[PDB]
Assembly symmetry: D2
Homo-oligomer: 89 residues x 4
């Protein structure tokens, strides 16, 4: 995220997830039911996906859309993400 | 896909999928075992995913990287597919 | 799918997919815009997933839930399906 | 997870996720480049997915396969998980 507001809202998502992952680690140590564990992991998966989507859009918008850039510059930028994107599906 | 070669290899992938979807429809009519159908379905999901990844990459290369475009042009192009990408994950 | 009710609803999904894929093949043959093509491929991927889901739930219910089975019988049936679930 | 080995290996996955998320939280606080962050976020998505996968397989084996259960018991257990599978 380039702009402060983007940085801000991504950090907010990450701290939420950290909290979920901490709650999940507690439940494993404390021997909480298998069902609950499965549910918590599903919540973490959903939130990680959601974070990935927002972050992909921010990155593309910041590096491929904005700025009086050249196609050569944007090609390098696209290549850096290409591996990430293939994996995303 | 803009270039003829890109159009060609996507059409090639789609025809492959058509073949699978045709075979699967056959297996359903023919009362073939459930496991096989589940498998054939899994292969179609797999090829559909792979087709998506590749097309996303081609589209991003053709509309966001290539061409002496303005940031305004790229924003319209990015918005046209923003929804697809969110949906893609 | 075992039951007629589950068998109709799966075929209906496939024929729907068939149609989308033929339309997609048509748009590629006719040289239509990238955007249109991207959008249909995305609709086909989505329909592929929905179908995978409906079919997984059917298979689990038919082979793991229904029937007075032994854990051994269910272990075999589960194993043939497990790798698929991992990929999904 | 029921067995100690399935319990250890899931905890090990969660702790590694914990680590990645704290590392990610760190890069954001410190103002590191966009690309690094996208990459770390992508590794966490990947790890979340793998964990979901492993846990689904563990849950299905422990509650649908193992144990002299009735189809009625398995139906209740299956329904509790069905939604999760669809979204997955």
């Amino acid at each position: 995220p380039h702009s402060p507001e983007d940085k801000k809202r991504i950090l907010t998502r990450v701290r939420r997830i950290r909290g979920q992952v901490e709650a999940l680690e507690r439940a494993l140590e404390s021997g909480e039911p298998c069902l609950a564990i499965l549910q918590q992991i599903a919540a973490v998966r959903g939130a990680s996906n959601g974070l990935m989507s927002e972050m992909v859009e921010i990155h593309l918008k910041d590096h491929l859309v904005s700025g009086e850039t050249t196609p050569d510059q944007r090609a390098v930028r696209m290549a850096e993400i290409g591996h990430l994107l293939r994996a995303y599906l």
